[PDB]
Amino acid sequence: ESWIREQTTVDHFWGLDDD
Amino acid sequence: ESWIREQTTVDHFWGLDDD
Amino acid sequence: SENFQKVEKIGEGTYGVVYKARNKLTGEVVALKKIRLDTETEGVPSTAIREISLLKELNHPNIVKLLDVIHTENKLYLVFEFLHQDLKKFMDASALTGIPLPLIKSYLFQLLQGLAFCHSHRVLHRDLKPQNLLINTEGAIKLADFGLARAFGVPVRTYTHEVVTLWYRAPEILLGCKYYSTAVDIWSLGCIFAEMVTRRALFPGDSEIDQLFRIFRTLGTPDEVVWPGVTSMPDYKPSFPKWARQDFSKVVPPLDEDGRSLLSQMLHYDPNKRISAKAALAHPFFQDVTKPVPHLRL
Amino acid sequence: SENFQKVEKIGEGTYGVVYKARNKLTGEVVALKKIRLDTETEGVPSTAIREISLLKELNHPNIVKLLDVIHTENKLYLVFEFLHQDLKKFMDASALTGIPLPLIKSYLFQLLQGLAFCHSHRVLHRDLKPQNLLINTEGAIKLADFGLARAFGVPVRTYTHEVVTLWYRAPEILLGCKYYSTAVDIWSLGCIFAEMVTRRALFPGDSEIDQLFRIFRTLGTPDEVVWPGVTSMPDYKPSFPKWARQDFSKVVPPLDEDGRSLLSQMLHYDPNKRISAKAALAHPFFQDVTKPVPHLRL
Amino acid sequence: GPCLVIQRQDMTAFFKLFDDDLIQDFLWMDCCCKIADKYLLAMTFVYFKRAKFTISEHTRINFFIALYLANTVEEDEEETKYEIFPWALGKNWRKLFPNFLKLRDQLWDRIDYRAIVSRRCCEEVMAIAPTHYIWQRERSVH
Amino acid sequence: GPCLVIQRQDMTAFFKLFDDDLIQDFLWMDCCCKIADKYLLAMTFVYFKRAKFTISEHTRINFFIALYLANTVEEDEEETKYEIFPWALGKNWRKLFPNFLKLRDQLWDRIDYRAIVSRRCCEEVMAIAPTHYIWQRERSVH
Ligand SMILES: [Zn+2]
Ligand SMILES: [Zn+2]
């Protein structure tokens, strides 16, 4: 048994931050 | 070669502190 | 044991069983404490090592004397000086008549003498309760059960909050604030002192948040002047209610003006401003102190 | 390499050797950087991983473009965009005549544009020196050598003091104080800006304690108001002498009123009050800025 | 756009690394979270999906090379990260460490040298299952 | 009086424990000095002279049982001291730890149960050779 999010979309997987 | 104190006399080896 | 003839069973707990026994060095009546050795580790408990290691170096007339330590493969015996009964059993026996004021004064002075010896020789009892304080037929009280006790001499050492019973637990530990010392034990004896006079526990709590509320019921909710760092704490919440601090005359009716002054300083909120065992002995309350024999009739 | 015809050797250091080369995709003149792989570990240096990992994600017109990464058992090649010469070689070539003010202004504006891109995308260059800034024949300057560069986005990360050359080193690092950021790079460009105008280094030190003294020679010894935590530092001693802060008119004679205002804010003592790359671009100094071609004659 | 869809089976296989007694002992060892904090553990998962590690490639040695890479990239103190060597190379690490670094470069090659892991990405991978104990591993002094 | 004369050869034999690569790796591991600080290392020497350990009895296992005893006596956090088990009992410590505790009690018996080591004594043993690196192992957060 495992309780983790079934499908997750990451908008920023590769790259640097923004500020 | 070792540079440690040749003879050391410990006044309080056994026991608790004093304050 | 072998060389000890077990007379009767007295105490019992998680630590083990306490017996009454004789010897081979005459009818030397002693307190033989059998230690409950762990089921899986089968090693000596941390509480036992700390108790034996401290008591092997503590020789004061108001501290229970350790006589011998029998250690075998599966056993650990602790030979102690026999003392007729504990404070709790005496407070229960004198619950309707009451312990006389000179005798209350004598016991508090004697307990303070022993605790001052501990704090000067940098030792925290961390478990001061009436069951852990032993009396004899000639009017002498002693600090017993050094199971939760530790040496506070060595700096930067780590400290636990699971130390004493709620009823005698210090508020700096009830509010989970680190860096505690000598003052914690003072709070427990201050609660014991009040208990001897009013014949009942000072703050008899049912939980941790209920214990704090029992303290603020009598001594009132603390401000950032009585206790400078009351709000800035790890276990603090703004939802804590403010309450009025009732006068000590109401709190302890049979105690005199000097007795009220000593009790208040022992139950001070700030640990850095709470009375020390050394300063409390000098109080004008112990000016007319004598050593009387306790009550025992058939 | 193979598919690259080595023309000539340009740079060299502890990092490796830099060459000029062609290709198989026409006469694409590039900068081929050969990395000196460790003798015992035979692993890629931390400086190389950080440089390649950052430049693989930094695409700005004022940042040197990384084209290809050739990695083999014992080799590590870095293909870069070829740029005629570095700032140091141009400052040495224009050491007697001098770099014209519109061209100084252009380069500073371009370097700030690239550094603002780094700081907004949370990247510290940590090694801003004229040798590490590349120019071309059409009047464009770029931030080169990201060897000592790191991403400062992730919190509670550890930071080293061995980061930039003394001459361009920030005083918050010269005074060994932890918690440094974007402001460190600003201090280096402020020193580079002054160097372009006066044709010589701003604070040319010989040691760490001598570098600090060169800064307090011009900007004066700091007080607990210009720099709030100047005395409360890890590498601070009361034996530090107090000195007068000479006016910027004397410090940089060919620079105008606006140029002096920008230079002072870049060389501010407090890192929390030192100008940011974003705020410095908005300065009234860059109101009459143009992109001119640099000097090149036979 | 730099997008990637993370599935349940990707995070389930990654959390199975912490089922090994050697790994759990290693996390226990690191009390101050100097070498294996939530951010460095967020980074080690990111490197796994980047290298496109298969189910059979989800081994203890692969976890340490990715964590070492995360310490090479984000941690300036070079000395601290050497504590990884005896946990993946046994008690002969003093001469077994260069071959580990070769694997670290091999993984760095496998991720197209894109070893920069942003705070935004770390917080995004953490949020998939924030209830997990490895994300409860916070730092205070750098 | 509780007096004891410490000779050069007593401190020389004790410092030879730190010549072992396993011991030096163990001290390296403990960065925050939670289990093996200057005071706990002052305590481990005190226990050696108390038990009256011979030259042949100056082993790595004896160093860990004495250090564990020092952590049992002076450190209230019981969880931290369990990190000693894998360094002296190998990678099978999960069932090898009770036999270590039996030795710890055996040493505690050998020192006549006098396991309390005062600050005065610790500062006195430290002062014999304060230039040594094990005394440069200070703590800040308990
Ligand atoms: Zn720590
Ligand atoms: Zn630490």
Numbering used by the authors:
A (entry chain C), B (entry chain C): 137 to 155
C (entry chain A), D (entry chain A): 1 to 298
E (entry chain B), F (entry chain B): 61 to 202
Question: What does the publication say?
Answer:
In mammals, the meiosis-specific LINC complex composed of KASH5 and SUN1 provides the binding site for telomeres for transmission of cytoskeletal forces to regulate telomere dynamics. Here, we identify a direct interaction between SUN1 and Speedy A (SPDYA) and determine the crystal structure of human SUN1-SPDYA-CDK2 ternary complex. CDK2 is a serine/threonine protein kinase that plays an important role in mitotic cell cycle regulation.
To understand how SUN1 is recognized by SPDYA, we purified the SUN1SBM–SPDYAERD–CDK2 ternary complex and determined its crystal structure using a single-wavelength anomalous dispersion method at a resolution of 3.2 Å. The structure reveals that the conformation of the SPDYAERD–CDK2 moiety in the ternary complex is almost identical to that of the previously reported crystal structure of the SPDYARingo–CDK2 complex except for the N-terminal strand β1 in SPDYAERD, which is essential for SUN1SBM binding but absent in the binary crystal structure. In both structures, CDK2 is stabilized in an active configuration through an interface involving the activation loop (T-Loop) and the αC helix of CDK2 and one side of the SPDYARingo domain. In the ternary complex structure, the SUN1SBM polypeptide chain mostly contacts the surface of SPDYAERD on the opposite side of the catalytic center of CDK2, suggesting that the binding of SUN1SBM does not interfere with CDK2’s catalytic activity. After the β strand, SUN1SBM makes a sharp turn so that SUN1Phe149 and SUN1Trp150 snugly fit into a hydrophobic cavity under strand β1 of SPDYAERD. At the C-terminus of SUN1SBM, the sidechain of Leu152 points into a hydrophobic pocket between the small and large lobes of CDK2, indicating that CDK2 may also play a role in the binding with SUN1. We focused on the SUN1Trp150 residue and found that substitution of this residue with alanine or arginine completely abolished the interaction as revealed by co-IP analyses.
